[PDB]
Amino acid sequence: AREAIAQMKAAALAGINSRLFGLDGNISTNSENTERHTA
Amino acid sequence: AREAIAQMKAAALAGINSRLFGLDGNISTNSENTERHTA
């Protein structure tokens, strides 16, 4: 049975790419403006 | 008659090869695979 177990564990895991990062929360698509308006 | 009996017993047994074994039950024409399949 020691063989058959390892065959199961290996058969049920393939293609799963770990990729320890998820996604970052910090977005900056465009920097902050910091300018004014007048008439 | 002691002679004639022994002649019968010897005449009626010839070519019979004893061969105390019959046949074994254990067959192994090809060993057991123990491998998997995936897509």
Side-chain angles (χ1 to χ4, degrees):
Chain A
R2 183 177 293 170
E3 184 175 2
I5 296 167
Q7 295 296 111
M8 292 180 185
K9 182 174 74 174
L13 295 174
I16 296 169
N17 190 359
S18 66
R19 187 179 294 277
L20 61 85
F21 292 103
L23 182 63
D24 183 79
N26 189 0
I27 57 89
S28 178
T29 186
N30 190 359
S31 296
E32 187 170 2
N33 191 0
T34 62
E35 293 295 329
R36 66 185 184 274
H37 295 285
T38 60
Chain B
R2 183 177 292 170
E3 184 175 2
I5 296 167
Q7 295 296 111
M8 292 180 185
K9 182 174 74 174
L13 295 174
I16 296 169
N17 190 359
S18 66
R19 187 179 294 277
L20 61 85
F21 292 103
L23 182 63
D24 183 79
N26 189 0
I27 57 89
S28 178
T29 186
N30 190 359
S31 296
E32 187 170 2
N33 191 0
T34 62
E35 293 295 329
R36 66 185 184 274
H37 295 285
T38 60

Short mmCIF file of all heavy atoms in Angstrom, two decimals:
data_model
loop_
_atom_site.label_atom_id
_atom_site.label_comp_id
_atom_site.label_asym_id
_atom_site.label_seq_id
_atom_site.Cartn_x
_atom_site.Cartn_y
_atom_site.Cartn_z
N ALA A 1 0.82 -1.20 0.00
CA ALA A 1 0.00 0.00 0.00
C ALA A 1 0.85 1.26 0.00
O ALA A 1 0.39 2.32 -0.43
CB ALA A 1 -0.92 0.01 1.21
N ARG A 2 2.09 1.16 0.48
CA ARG A 2 2.98 2.31 0.51
C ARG A 2 3.24 2.85 -0.89
O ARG A 2 3.50 4.04 -1.05
CB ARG A 2 4.29 1.91 1.19
CG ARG A 2 5.28 3.02 1.36
CD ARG A 2 6.49 2.51 2.11
NE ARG A 2 6.17 2.17 3.48
CZ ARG A 2 6.99 1.53 4.31
NH1 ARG A 2 8.19 1.14 3.92
NH2 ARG A 2 6.59 1.28 5.54
N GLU A 3 3.18 1.99 -1.90
CA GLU A 3 3.31 2.45 -3.28
C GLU A 3 2.04 3.13 -3.75
O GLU A 3 2.08 4.22 -4.35
CB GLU A 3 3.66 1.28 -4.19
CG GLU A 3 3.93 1.67 -5.63
CD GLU A 3 4.39 0.50 -6.47
OE1 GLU A 3 4.48 -0.63 -5.94
OE2 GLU A 3 4.68 0.70 -7.67
N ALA A 4 0.89 2.51 -3.50
CA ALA A 4 -0.36 2.99 -4.06
C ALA A 4 -0.72 4.37 -3.53
O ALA A 4 -1.30 5.19 -4.26
CB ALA A 4 -1.48 2.01 -3.76
N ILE A 5 -0.40 4.65 -2.26
CA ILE A 5 -0.71 5.95 -1.69
C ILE A 5 0.03 7.04 -2.46
O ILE A 5 -0.55 8.05 -2.87
CB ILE A 5 -0.35 5.99 -0.20
CG1 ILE A 5 -1.25 5.00 0.55
CG2 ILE A 5 -0.58 7.37 0.39
CD1 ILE A 5 -0.82 4.71 1.96
N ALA A 6 1.33 6.84 -2.68
CA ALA A 6 2.13 7.86 -3.34
C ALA A 6 1.66 8.08 -4.77
O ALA A 6 1.75 9.20 -5.29
CB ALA A 6 3.60 7.47 -3.30
N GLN A 7 1.15 7.03 -5.42
CA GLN A 7 0.61 7.21 -6.75
C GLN A 7 -0.62 8.10 -6.72
O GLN A 7 -0.82 8.92 -7.63
CB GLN A 7 0.26 5.86 -7.37
CG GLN A 7 1.43 4.94 -7.63
CD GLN A 7 2.39 5.49 -8.64
OE1 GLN A 7 3.51 5.87 -8.32
NE2 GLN A 7 1.96 5.54 -9.89
N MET A 8 -1.45 7.97 -5.69
CA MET A 8 -2.62 8.83 -5.57
C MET A 8 -2.20 10.28 -5.39
O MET A 8 -2.68 11.17 -6.10
CB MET A 8 -3.50 8.39 -4.40
CG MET A 8 -4.18 7.07 -4.57
SD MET A 8 -5.16 6.68 -3.13
CE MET A 8 -5.69 5.04 -3.55
N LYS A 9 -1.31 10.53 -4.43
CA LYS A 9 -0.90 11.89 -4.11
C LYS A 9 -0.28 12.58 -5.31
O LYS A 9 -0.45 13.79 -5.49
CB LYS A 9 0.07 11.87 -2.94
CG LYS A 9 0.54 13.23 -2.47
CD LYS A 9 1.39 13.14 -1.22
CE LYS A 9 2.76 12.60 -1.51
NZ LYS A 9 3.64 12.64 -0.32
N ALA A 10 0.43 11.82 -6.15
CA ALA A 10 1.05 12.41 -7.33
C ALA A 10 0.06 12.55 -8.48
O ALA A 10 0.20 13.46 -9.30
CB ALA A 10 2.23 11.56 -7.78
N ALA A 11 -0.93 11.67 -8.54
CA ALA A 11 -1.90 11.74 -9.63
C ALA A 11 -2.85 12.91 -9.45
O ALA A 11 -3.32 13.49 -10.43
CB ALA A 11 -2.68 10.44 -9.73
N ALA A 12 -3.14 13.26 -8.20
CA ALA A 12 -4.11 14.30 -7.90
C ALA A 12 -3.50 15.68 -7.80
O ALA A 12 -4.18 16.61 -7.36
CB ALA A 12 -4.82 13.96 -6.60
N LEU A 13 -2.24 15.85 -8.18
CA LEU A 13 -1.58 17.15 -8.16
C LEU A 13 -0.73 17.29 -9.40
O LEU A 13 0.33 16.65 -9.52
CB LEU A 13 -0.74 17.32 -6.90
CG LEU A 13 -1.49 17.34 -5.58
CD1 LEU A 13 -0.50 17.37 -4.45
CD2 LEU A 13 -2.38 18.53 -5.50
N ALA A 14 -1.18 18.12 -10.33
CA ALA A 14 -0.44 18.37 -11.55
C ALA A 14 -1.03 19.61 -12.20
O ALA A 14 -2.25 19.75 -12.28
CB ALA A 14 -0.50 17.18 -12.50
N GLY A 15 -0.15 20.50 -12.65
CA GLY A 15 -0.56 21.77 -13.21
C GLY A 15 -0.74 22.88 -12.20
O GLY A 15 -0.73 24.05 -12.58
N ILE A 16 -0.92 22.54 -10.92
CA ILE A 16 -1.07 23.56 -9.89
C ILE A 16 0.26 24.30 -9.78
O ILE A 16 1.26 23.73 -9.35
CB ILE A 16 -1.49 22.94 -8.55
CG1 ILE A 16 -2.88 22.30 -8.69
CG2 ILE A 16 -1.52 24.01 -7.44
CD1 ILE A 16 -3.31 21.43 -7.53
N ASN A 17 0.25 25.57 -10.15
CA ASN A 17 1.42 26.43 -10.07
C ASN A 17 1.30 27.25 -8.79
O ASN A 17 0.33 27.99 -8.61
CB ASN A 17 1.50 27.33 -11.30
CG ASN A 17 2.81 28.07 -11.40
OD1 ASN A 17 3.68 27.95 -10.53
ND2 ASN A 17 2.96 28.86 -12.45
N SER A 18 2.29 27.12 -7.91
CA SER A 18 2.19 27.65 -6.55
C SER A 18 2.03 29.17 -6.55
O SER A 18 0.98 29.67 -6.16
CB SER A 18 3.41 27.23 -5.74
OG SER A 18 4.58 27.83 -6.24
N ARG A 19 3.06 29.89 -7.00
CA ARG A 19 2.97 31.34 -7.18
C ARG A 19 2.63 32.04 -5.85
O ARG A 19 1.53 32.54 -5.65
CB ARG A 19 1.94 31.68 -8.26
CG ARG A 19 1.88 33.14 -8.65
CD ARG A 19 0.85 33.36 -9.73
NE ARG A 19 1.22 32.70 -10.98
CZ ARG A 19 2.06 33.20 -11.89
NH1 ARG A 19 2.64 34.38 -11.72
NH2 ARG A 19 2.32 32.50 -12.98
N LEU A 20 3.61 32.02 -4.95
CA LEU A 20 3.37 32.39 -3.55
C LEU A 20 2.78 33.78 -3.38
O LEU A 20 2.19 34.06 -2.33
CB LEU A 20 4.67 32.29 -2.74
CG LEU A 20 5.89 33.14 -3.08
CD1 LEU A 20 5.84 34.50 -2.46
CD2 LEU A 20 7.12 32.45 -2.57
N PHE A 21 2.92 34.66 -4.36
CA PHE A 21 2.27 35.96 -4.32
C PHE A 21 0.87 35.87 -4.90
O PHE A 21 0.59 35.08 -5.81
CB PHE A 21 3.06 37.00 -5.09
CG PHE A 21 4.36 37.35 -4.47
CD1 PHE A 21 5.54 36.84 -4.98
CD2 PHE A 21 4.41 38.19 -3.39
CE1 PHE A 21 6.74 37.16 -4.41
CE2 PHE A 21 5.61 38.52 -2.81
CZ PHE A 21 6.78 38.00 -3.32
N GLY A 22 -0.01 36.72 -4.39
CA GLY A 22 -1.37 36.84 -4.87
C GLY A 22 -1.50 38.03 -5.78
O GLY A 22 -1.17 37.96 -6.97
N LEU A 23 -2.01 39.14 -5.24
CA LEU A 23 -1.94 40.42 -5.92
C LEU A 23 -1.66 41.52 -4.92
O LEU A 23 -2.08 41.45 -3.76
CB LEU A 23 -3.23 40.73 -6.68
CG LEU A 23 -3.22 42.04 -7.47
CD1 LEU A 23 -2.17 42.03 -8.56
CD2 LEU A 23 -4.54 42.27 -8.06
N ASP A 24 -0.95 42.54 -5.38
CA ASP A 24 -0.65 43.70 -4.57
C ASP A 24 -1.85 44.63 -4.52
O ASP A 24 -2.62 44.74 -5.48
CB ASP A 24 0.55 44.45 -5.16
CG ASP A 24 0.96 45.63 -4.32
OD1 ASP A 24 1.63 45.42 -3.29
OD2 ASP A 24 0.59 46.76 -4.68
N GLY A 25 -2.01 45.31 -3.38
CA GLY A 25 -3.09 46.26 -3.24
C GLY A 25 -2.76 47.63 -3.77
O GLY A 25 -3.65 48.35 -4.23
N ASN A 26 -1.49 48.02 -3.72
CA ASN A 26 -1.08 49.35 -4.17
C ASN A 26 -1.21 49.44 -5.68
O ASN A 26 -0.50 48.74 -6.41
CB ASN A 26 0.34 49.67 -3.73
CG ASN A 26 0.71 51.11 -4.00
OD1 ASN A 26 -0.09 51.90 -4.50
ND2 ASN A 26 1.95 51.47 -3.67
N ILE A 27 -2.10 50.30 -6.12
CA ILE A 27 -2.24 50.67 -7.53
C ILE A 27 -1.74 52.09 -7.69
O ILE A 27 -1.91 52.92 -6.79
CB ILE A 27 -3.69 50.52 -8.03
CG1 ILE A 27 -4.71 51.34 -7.22
CG2 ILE A 27 -4.09 49.07 -7.99
CD1 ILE A 27 -4.95 52.78 -7.71
N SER A 28 -1.09 52.36 -8.81
CA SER A 28 -0.84 53.72 -9.26
C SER A 28 -0.91 53.69 -10.79
O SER A 28 0.11 53.50 -11.46
CB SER A 28 0.49 54.27 -8.77
OG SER A 28 0.70 55.58 -9.27
N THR A 29 -2.11 53.88 -11.32
CA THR A 29 -2.26 54.01 -12.76
C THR A 29 -1.88 55.40 -13.24
O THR A 29 -1.43 55.57 -14.38
CB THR A 29 -3.70 53.68 -13.18
OG1 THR A 29 -3.80 53.68 -14.61
CG2 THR A 29 -4.72 54.67 -12.58
N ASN A 30 -2.04 56.40 -12.38
CA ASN A 30 -1.68 57.77 -12.69
C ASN A 30 -1.36 58.49 -11.39
O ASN A 30 -2.14 58.40 -10.44
CB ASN A 30 -2.81 58.48 -13.44
CG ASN A 30 -2.39 59.83 -14.00
OD1 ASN A 30 -1.25 60.26 -13.82
ND2 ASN A 30 -3.31 60.50 -14.67
N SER A 31 -0.23 59.18 -11.36
CA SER A 31 0.21 59.85 -10.14
C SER A 31 -0.79 60.92 -9.72
O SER A 31 -1.64 61.37 -10.49
CB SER A 31 1.59 60.47 -10.35
OG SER A 31 2.56 59.47 -10.60
N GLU A 32 -0.67 61.34 -8.46
CA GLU A 32 -1.57 62.33 -7.90
C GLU A 32 -1.27 63.71 -8.46
O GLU A 32 -0.10 64.09 -8.63
CB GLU A 32 -1.45 62.31 -6.38
CG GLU A 32 -2.46 63.17 -5.65
CD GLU A 32 -2.44 62.92 -4.16
OE1 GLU A 32 -1.60 62.11 -3.70
OE2 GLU A 32 -3.26 63.52 -3.44
N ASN A 33 -2.33 64.47 -8.76
CA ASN A 33 -2.19 65.68 -9.55
C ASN A 33 -1.59 66.83 -8.73
O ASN A 33 -0.50 67.32 -9.04
CB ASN A 33 -3.55 66.07 -10.11
CG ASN A 33 -3.46 67.17 -11.15
OD1 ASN A 33 -2.38 67.66 -11.47
ND2 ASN A 33 -4.61 67.57 -11.68
N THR A 34 -2.29 67.25 -7.68
CA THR A 34 -1.87 68.37 -6.83
C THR A 34 -1.71 69.66 -7.65
O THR A 34 -0.62 70.23 -7.75
CB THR A 34 -0.57 68.06 -6.08
OG1 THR A 34 0.50 67.83 -7.00
CG2 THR A 34 -0.74 66.84 -5.19
N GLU A 35 -2.81 70.11 -8.23
CA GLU A 35 -2.88 71.41 -8.88
C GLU A 35 -4.26 72.01 -8.67
O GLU A 35 -5.18 71.34 -8.19
CB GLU A 35 -2.55 71.30 -10.38
CG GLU A 35 -1.11 70.91 -10.70
CD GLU A 35 -0.10 71.95 -10.26
OE1 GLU A 35 -0.44 73.15 -10.26
OE2 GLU A 35 1.04 71.57 -9.93
N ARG A 36 -4.40 73.27 -9.06
CA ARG A 36 -5.54 74.10 -8.69
C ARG A 36 -6.39 74.45 -9.91
O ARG A 36 -6.13 74.01 -11.03
CB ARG A 36 -5.06 75.37 -7.99
CG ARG A 36 -4.26 76.31 -8.88
CD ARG A 36 -3.72 77.47 -8.09
NE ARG A 36 -3.02 78.44 -8.94
CZ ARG A 36 -1.74 78.37 -9.29
NH1 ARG A 36 -0.96 77.37 -8.90
NH2 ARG A 36 -1.23 79.32 -10.05
N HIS A 37 -7.41 75.26 -9.67
CA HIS A 37 -8.24 75.84 -10.71
C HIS A 37 -8.69 77.22 -10.26
O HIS A 37 -8.96 77.43 -9.07
CB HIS A 37 -9.48 75.00 -11.02
CG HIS A 37 -9.18 73.65 -11.60
ND1 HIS A 37 -8.77 73.48 -12.91
CD2 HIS A 37 -9.26 72.41 -11.06
CE1 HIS A 37 -8.59 72.19 -13.14
NE2 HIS A 37 -8.88 71.52 -12.04
N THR A 38 -8.79 78.14 -11.21
CA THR A 38 -9.37 79.46 -10.98
C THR A 38 -10.26 79.81 -12.16
O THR A 38 -10.38 79.04 -13.12
CB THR A 38 -8.29 80.53 -10.78
OG1 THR A 38 -7.47 80.62 -11.95
CG2 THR A 38 -7.43 80.22 -9.59
N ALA A 39 -10.88 80.97 -12.08
CA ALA A 39 -11.73 81.45 -13.16
C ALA A 39 -10.89 81.99 -14.31
O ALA A 39 -11.26 81.86 -15.47
CB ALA A 39 -12.66 82.51 -12.64
N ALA B 1 2.08 -70.07 -8.88
CA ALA B 1 1.32 -68.85 -9.12
C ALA B 1 2.08 -67.61 -8.66
O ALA B 1 1.82 -66.51 -9.16
CB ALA B 1 -0.02 -68.92 -8.41
N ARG B 2 3.00 -67.78 -7.72
CA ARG B 2 3.78 -66.65 -7.22
C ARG B 2 4.59 -66.00 -8.33
O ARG B 2 4.87 -64.80 -8.27
CB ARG B 2 4.69 -67.13 -6.10
CG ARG B 2 5.50 -66.06 -5.43
CD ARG B 2 6.29 -66.65 -4.29
NE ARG B 2 5.44 -67.10 -3.21
CZ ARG B 2 5.85 -67.82 -2.18
NH1 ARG B 2 7.11 -68.21 -2.05
NH2 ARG B 2 4.98 -68.17 -1.25
N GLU B 3 4.97 -66.78 -9.35
CA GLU B 3 5.66 -66.20 -10.50
C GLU B 3 4.69 -65.46 -11.40
O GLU B 3 4.97 -64.33 -11.83
CB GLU B 3 6.38 -67.30 -11.28
CG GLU B 3 7.22 -66.80 -12.44
CD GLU B 3 8.01 -67.91 -13.10
OE1 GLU B 3 7.88 -69.07 -12.68
OE2 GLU B 3 8.77 -67.61 -14.05
N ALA B 4 3.55 -66.08 -11.70
CA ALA B 4 2.64 -65.52 -12.69
C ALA B 4 2.07 -64.19 -12.25
O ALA B 4 1.84 -63.30 -13.08
CB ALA B 4 1.51 -66.51 -12.97
N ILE B 5 1.83 -64.02 -10.95
CA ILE B 5 1.29 -62.76 -10.45
C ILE B 5 2.27 -61.63 -10.75
O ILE B 5 1.89 -60.58 -11.28
CB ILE B 5 0.98 -62.86 -8.95
CG1 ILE B 5 -0.12 -63.89 -8.72
CG2 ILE B 5 0.52 -61.52 -8.40
CD1 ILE B 5 -0.32 -64.30 -7.30
N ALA B 6 3.54 -61.84 -10.42
CA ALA B 6 4.52 -60.78 -10.60
C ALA B 6 4.70 -60.44 -12.07
O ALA B 6 4.98 -59.28 -12.41
CB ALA B 6 5.85 -61.21 -9.98
N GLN B 7 4.52 -61.42 -12.95
CA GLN B 7 4.58 -61.12 -14.37
C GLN B 7 3.44 -60.21 -14.79
O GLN B 7 3.62 -59.31 -15.62
CB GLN B 7 4.54 -62.41 -15.19
CG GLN B 7 5.73 -63.32 -15.01
CD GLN B 7 7.02 -62.71 -15.49
OE1 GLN B 7 7.89 -62.39 -14.69
NE2 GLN B 7 7.14 -62.55 -16.79
N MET B 8 2.26 -60.41 -14.21
CA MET B 8 1.13 -59.53 -14.52
C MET B 8 1.41 -58.11 -14.06
O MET B 8 1.26 -57.16 -14.82
CB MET B 8 -0.15 -60.05 -13.86
CG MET B 8 -0.67 -61.34 -14.41
SD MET B 8 -2.17 -61.83 -13.55
CE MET B 8 -2.45 -63.42 -14.29
N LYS B 9 1.82 -57.97 -12.80
CA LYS B 9 2.03 -56.65 -12.22
C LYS B 9 3.09 -55.87 -12.99
O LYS B 9 2.99 -54.65 -13.13
CB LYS B 9 2.43 -56.78 -10.76
CG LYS B 9 2.64 -55.47 -10.02
CD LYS B 9 2.88 -55.68 -8.54
CE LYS B 9 4.26 -56.23 -8.28
NZ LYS B 9 4.55 -56.30 -6.83
N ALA B 10 4.09 -56.57 -13.52
CA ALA B 10 5.14 -55.90 -14.28
C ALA B 10 4.72 -55.64 -15.71
O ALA B 10 5.17 -54.67 -16.32
CB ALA B 10 6.41 -56.73 -14.26
N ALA B 11 3.86 -56.50 -16.26
CA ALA B 11 3.44 -56.31 -17.64
C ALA B 11 2.47 -55.15 -17.78
O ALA B 11 2.45 -54.48 -18.82
CB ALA B 11 2.78 -57.58 -18.17
N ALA B 12 1.69 -54.89 -16.74
CA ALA B 12 0.66 -53.86 -16.79
C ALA B 12 1.15 -52.51 -16.32
O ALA B 12 0.33 -51.61 -16.13
CB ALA B 12 -0.52 -54.30 -15.94
N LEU B 13 2.46 -52.33 -16.13
CA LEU B 13 3.02 -51.05 -15.73
C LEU B 13 4.32 -50.83 -16.49
O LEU B 13 5.33 -51.48 -16.20
CB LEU B 13 3.26 -51.00 -14.22
CG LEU B 13 2.02 -51.08 -13.34
CD1 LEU B 13 2.45 -51.17 -11.91
CD2 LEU B 13 1.17 -49.88 -13.54
N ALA B 14 4.28 -49.92 -17.45
CA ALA B 14 5.46 -49.58 -18.22
C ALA B 14 5.17 -48.28 -18.95
O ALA B 14 4.09 -48.11 -19.52
CB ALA B 14 5.81 -50.69 -19.21
N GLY B 15 6.14 -47.37 -18.92
CA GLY B 15 5.98 -46.06 -19.49
C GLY B 15 5.38 -45.03 -18.55
O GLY B 15 5.53 -43.83 -18.79
N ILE B 16 4.69 -45.47 -17.50
CA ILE B 16 4.10 -44.54 -16.54
C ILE B 16 5.25 -43.84 -15.83
O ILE B 16 6.00 -44.46 -15.06
CB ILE B 16 3.17 -45.25 -15.56
CG1 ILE B 16 1.98 -45.85 -16.31
CG2 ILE B 16 2.66 -44.28 -14.48
CD1 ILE B 16 1.11 -46.80 -15.52
N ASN B 17 5.38 -42.54 -16.07
CA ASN B 17 6.40 -41.71 -15.43
C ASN B 17 5.75 -40.99 -14.25
O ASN B 17 4.77 -40.25 -14.44
CB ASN B 17 6.98 -40.72 -16.43
CG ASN B 17 8.19 -39.99 -15.91
OD1 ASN B 17 8.62 -40.21 -14.78
ND2 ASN B 17 8.75 -39.12 -16.74
N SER B 18 6.27 -41.22 -13.05
CA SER B 18 5.60 -40.80 -11.83
C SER B 18 5.44 -39.29 -11.76
O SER B 18 4.31 -38.80 -11.80
CB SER B 18 6.38 -41.31 -10.61
OG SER B 18 7.65 -40.70 -10.53
N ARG B 19 6.55 -38.55 -11.68
CA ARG B 19 6.52 -37.09 -11.75
C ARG B 19 5.65 -36.50 -10.64
O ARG B 19 4.55 -35.99 -10.87
CB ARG B 19 6.03 -36.64 -13.13
CG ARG B 19 6.12 -35.15 -13.39
CD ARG B 19 5.63 -34.83 -14.78
NE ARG B 19 6.50 -35.39 -15.81
CZ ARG B 19 7.63 -34.83 -16.24
NH1 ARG B 19 8.06 -33.68 -15.75
NH2 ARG B 19 8.33 -35.44 -17.18
N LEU B 20 6.16 -36.61 -9.41
CA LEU B 20 5.35 -36.35 -8.22
C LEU B 20 4.72 -34.97 -8.20
O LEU B 20 3.74 -34.77 -7.47
CB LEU B 20 6.19 -36.55 -6.95
CG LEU B 20 7.43 -35.70 -6.68
CD1 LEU B 20 7.11 -34.39 -6.02
CD2 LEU B 20 8.35 -36.45 -5.76
N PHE B 21 5.24 -34.01 -8.95
CA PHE B 21 4.61 -32.71 -9.08
C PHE B 21 3.59 -32.72 -10.20
O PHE B 21 3.72 -33.43 -11.19
CB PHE B 21 5.64 -31.62 -9.36
CG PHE B 21 6.56 -31.36 -8.22
CD1 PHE B 21 7.85 -31.84 -8.23
CD2 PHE B 21 6.14 -30.61 -7.15
CE1 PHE B 21 8.69 -31.59 -7.19
CE2 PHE B 21 6.98 -30.35 -6.10
CZ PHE B 21 8.26 -30.85 -6.12
N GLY B 22 2.56 -31.90 -10.02
CA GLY B 22 1.52 -31.71 -11.02
C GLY B 22 1.76 -30.45 -11.80
O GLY B 22 2.56 -30.43 -12.74
N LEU B 23 1.06 -29.38 -11.43
CA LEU B 23 1.38 -28.05 -11.91
C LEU B 23 1.20 -27.04 -10.79
O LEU B 23 0.34 -27.20 -9.92
CB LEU B 23 0.53 -27.65 -13.11
CG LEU B 23 0.85 -26.28 -13.71
CD1 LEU B 23 2.26 -26.22 -14.26
CD2 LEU B 23 -0.11 -25.98 -14.78
N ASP B 24 2.02 -26.00 -10.83
CA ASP B 24 1.94 -24.91 -9.88
C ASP B 24 0.81 -23.97 -10.25
O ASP B 24 0.52 -23.76 -11.43
CB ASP B 24 3.26 -24.15 -9.84
CG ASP B 24 3.27 -23.05 -8.81
OD1 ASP B 24 3.45 -23.35 -7.62
OD2 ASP B 24 3.06 -21.88 -9.20
N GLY B 25 0.18 -23.38 -9.23
CA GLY B 25 -0.88 -22.43 -9.47
C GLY B 25 -0.37 -21.02 -9.70
O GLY B 25 -1.00 -20.25 -10.43
N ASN B 26 0.76 -20.67 -9.10
CA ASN B 26 1.29 -19.32 -9.22
C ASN B 26 1.81 -19.10 -10.63
O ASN B 26 2.77 -19.74 -11.05
CB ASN B 26 2.40 -19.06 -8.20
CG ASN B 26 2.82 -17.60 -8.17
OD1 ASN B 26 2.29 -16.77 -8.89
ND2 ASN B 26 3.80 -17.30 -7.33
N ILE B 27 1.17 -18.18 -11.33
CA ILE B 27 1.62 -17.70 -12.63
C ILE B 27 2.12 -16.28 -12.45
O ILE B 27 1.58 -15.52 -11.64
CB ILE B 27 0.52 -17.77 -13.71
CG1 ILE B 27 -0.76 -17.00 -13.33
CG2 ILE B 27 0.16 -19.21 -13.96
CD1 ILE B 27 -0.80 -15.52 -13.75
N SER B 28 3.18 -15.93 -13.17
CA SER B 28 3.57 -14.54 -13.36
C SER B 28 4.15 -14.44 -14.77
O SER B 28 5.36 -14.60 -14.97
CB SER B 28 4.56 -14.06 -12.31
OG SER B 28 4.94 -12.72 -12.57
N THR B 29 3.28 -14.19 -15.74
CA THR B 29 3.74 -13.93 -17.10
C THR B 29 4.26 -12.52 -17.25
O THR B 29 5.14 -12.27 -18.08
CB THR B 29 2.61 -14.20 -18.10
OG1 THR B 29 3.11 -14.08 -19.43
CG2 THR B 29 1.42 -13.24 -17.91
N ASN B 30 3.74 -11.58 -16.46
CA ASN B 30 4.18 -10.20 -16.48
C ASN B 30 3.91 -9.60 -15.11
O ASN B 30 2.81 -9.75 -14.57
CB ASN B 30 3.46 -9.41 -17.57
CG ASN B 30 4.05 -8.03 -17.78
OD1 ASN B 30 5.00 -7.64 -17.11
ND2 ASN B 30 3.48 -7.29 -18.72
N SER B 31 4.91 -8.94 -14.54
CA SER B 31 4.80 -8.38 -13.21
C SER B 31 3.69 -7.33 -13.15
O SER B 31 3.24 -6.80 -14.17
CB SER B 31 6.12 -7.77 -12.77
OG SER B 31 7.13 -8.77 -12.67
N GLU B 32 3.27 -7.02 -11.93
CA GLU B 32 2.20 -6.07 -11.71
C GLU B 32 2.69 -4.65 -11.98
O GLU B 32 3.81 -4.28 -11.62
CB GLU B 32 1.67 -6.21 -10.29
CG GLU B 32 0.44 -5.39 -9.98
CD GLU B 32 -0.16 -5.76 -8.64
OE1 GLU B 32 0.42 -6.63 -7.94
OE2 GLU B 32 -1.22 -5.21 -8.29
N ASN B 33 1.83 -3.85 -12.63
CA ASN B 33 2.27 -2.57 -13.18
C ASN B 33 2.46 -1.51 -12.10
O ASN B 33 3.57 -1.01 -11.88
CB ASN B 33 1.26 -2.10 -14.23
CG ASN B 33 1.76 -0.93 -15.04
OD1 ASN B 33 2.87 -0.44 -14.83
ND2 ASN B 33 0.94 -0.47 -15.96
N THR B 34 1.38 -1.16 -11.41
CA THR B 34 1.39 -0.12 -10.37
C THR B 34 1.85 1.22 -10.93
O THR B 34 2.88 1.78 -10.52
CB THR B 34 2.25 -0.53 -9.17
OG1 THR B 34 3.62 -0.70 -9.57
CG2 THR B 34 1.75 -1.80 -8.54
N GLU B 35 1.08 1.74 -11.88
CA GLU B 35 1.28 3.09 -12.39
C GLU B 35 -0.07 3.70 -12.73
O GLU B 35 -1.10 3.02 -12.73
CB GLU B 35 2.20 3.11 -13.61
CG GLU B 35 3.65 2.71 -13.34
CD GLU B 35 4.37 3.69 -12.43
OE1 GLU B 35 4.04 4.89 -12.47
OE2 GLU B 35 5.27 3.26 -11.68
N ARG B 36 -0.06 4.99 -13.03
CA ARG B 36 -1.27 5.81 -13.10
C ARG B 36 -1.53 6.28 -14.53
O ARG B 36 -0.81 5.93 -15.48
CB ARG B 36 -1.14 7.01 -12.17
CG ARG B 36 -0.06 8.00 -12.56
CD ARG B 36 0.09 9.09 -11.52
NE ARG B 36 1.06 10.11 -11.91
CZ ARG B 36 2.37 10.04 -11.70
NH1 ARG B 36 2.93 9.00 -11.10
NH2 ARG B 36 3.14 11.04 -12.10
N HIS B 37 -2.58 7.08 -14.67
CA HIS B 37 -2.90 7.77 -15.92
C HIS B 37 -3.52 9.11 -15.58
O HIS B 37 -4.26 9.24 -14.60
CB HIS B 37 -3.88 6.98 -16.78
CG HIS B 37 -3.35 5.68 -17.30
ND1 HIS B 37 -2.43 5.61 -18.32
CD2 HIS B 37 -3.62 4.41 -16.94
CE1 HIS B 37 -2.15 4.34 -18.57
NE2 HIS B 37 -2.86 3.59 -17.74
N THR B 38 -3.23 10.12 -16.40
CA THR B 38 -3.87 11.42 -16.32
C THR B 38 -4.19 11.88 -17.73
O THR B 38 -3.89 11.20 -18.72
CB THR B 38 -2.99 12.45 -15.60
OG1 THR B 38 -1.76 12.62 -16.31
CG2 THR B 38 -2.71 12.03 -14.20
N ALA B 39 -4.81 13.05 -17.83
CA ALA B 39 -5.14 13.63 -19.12
C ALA B 39 -3.91 14.25 -19.76
O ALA B 39 -3.75 14.23 -20.98
CB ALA B 39 -6.22 14.67 -18.95
#
